[PDB]
Homo-oligomer: A and B are copies of this chain.
Amino acid sequence: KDGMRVGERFTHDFVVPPHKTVRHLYPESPEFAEAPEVFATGFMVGLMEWACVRAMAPYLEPGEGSLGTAICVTHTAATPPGLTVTVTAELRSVEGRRLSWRVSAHDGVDEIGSGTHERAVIHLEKFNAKVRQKT
């Protein structure tokens, strides 16, 4: 099924809506009530994962998916709704079921962060079997 090529750059573009602020991450949080209306770090983490997931999708076999096992990034500029965040993900290596990525993001105005992200390829159903032993 042809594997992924190291050093290949992939881009994921995302126009930030109003509902990806700090407060929308945890509406349960009174303590976030005053947070500026900017793209939340937690949502940026999810966007970077999302970028890597799209890239690996055609390469995964039937029944397969992945989980994020590590993330190590800066978040050095804030983004209001309306700007487009472009994520660039580049494959650093694959060693077994472990894929390592470098990732970075730009909102068309500033670079907003960069660093690394690691994922693990899993068989979706047999993973749920392991999880359910916890539920």
Contact = CB atoms under 8 A, between A and B. Distances in A.
| Chain copies in complex | 2
A72 B69 contact: no
A83 interface: yes
The secondary-structure label for the interface of chain A is: mixed
A57 B75 contact: no
A124 interface: yes
Nearest to A64: B34
A93 interface: no
B42 A46 contact: yes
B25 A42 contact: yes
Contacts of A90: none
Contacts of A46: 25-26, 40-42
12 contacts: A26-B43, A36-B122, A36-B124, A36-B127, A36-B131, A42-B42, A42-B49, A45-B45, A70-B75, A71-B71, A71-B73, A78-B127
Interface of A: 25-26, 29, 31-32, 34-38, 40-43, 45-47, 49-50, 53-54, 57, 65, 67-76, 78-83, 107, 109-110, 115, 122, 124, 127-128, 131-132, 134-135
